[PDB]
Amino acid sequence: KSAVVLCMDVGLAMSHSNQGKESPFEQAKKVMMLFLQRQVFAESKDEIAVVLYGTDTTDNALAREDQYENISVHRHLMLPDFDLLEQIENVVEPGSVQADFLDALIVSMDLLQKETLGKKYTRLHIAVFSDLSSPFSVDQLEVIIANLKKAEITLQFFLPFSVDGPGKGLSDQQKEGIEMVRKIMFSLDGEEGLSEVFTFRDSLERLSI
């Protein structure tokens, strides 16, 4: 079996709807639901956690004043079920704030480190869904990368636009986030990584590999 964290940006920017009929938030939720439905219907043994960042409340093991704020562990590492499906469809809502995606990655890594103790997995996987609209701190990113390598974690980023026609009006902050994603993925996978940025439209199939 494998262990997967879905690390989902639910910050305020994700609710801005100017691409089609579904906002980035609603598109990412739909992908998560289809993925989880596939897993439930197939009776897969993979364990799947859900970490949300950009939530109005804070609920994670690293949270303490001014640290890892606005990040919530919605589902711990366990088999998916219909309660999870019901919550994601009805409970999970857009947040009214923003959070640091590297903080959310650290929470996700800490969850995996603790909750995979004493168990055997073929792969550890973290999938991040975001529009990269909000700032982040790179403090100690070199430690994060070292541990992602040590634990052989596969990291996938999914964005609601292509980063390979007209330009898409990406903010400077989004462009900085994209470059950081590229630096992280290259650190992990080398030259191949520079292109390992995926879109929401391809995310369901890339997840289900």
Binding site: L62, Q67, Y68, D100, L102, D103, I106, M109, D110, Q113, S137, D139, Q140, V143, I144, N147
Partner: peptide, 11 residues
């Protein structure tokens, strides 16, 4: 903005 990593990451 500095952060504090959990000890298992920096041990």
């Amino acid at each position: 903005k500095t952060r504090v990593l959990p000890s298992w990451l920096t041990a």
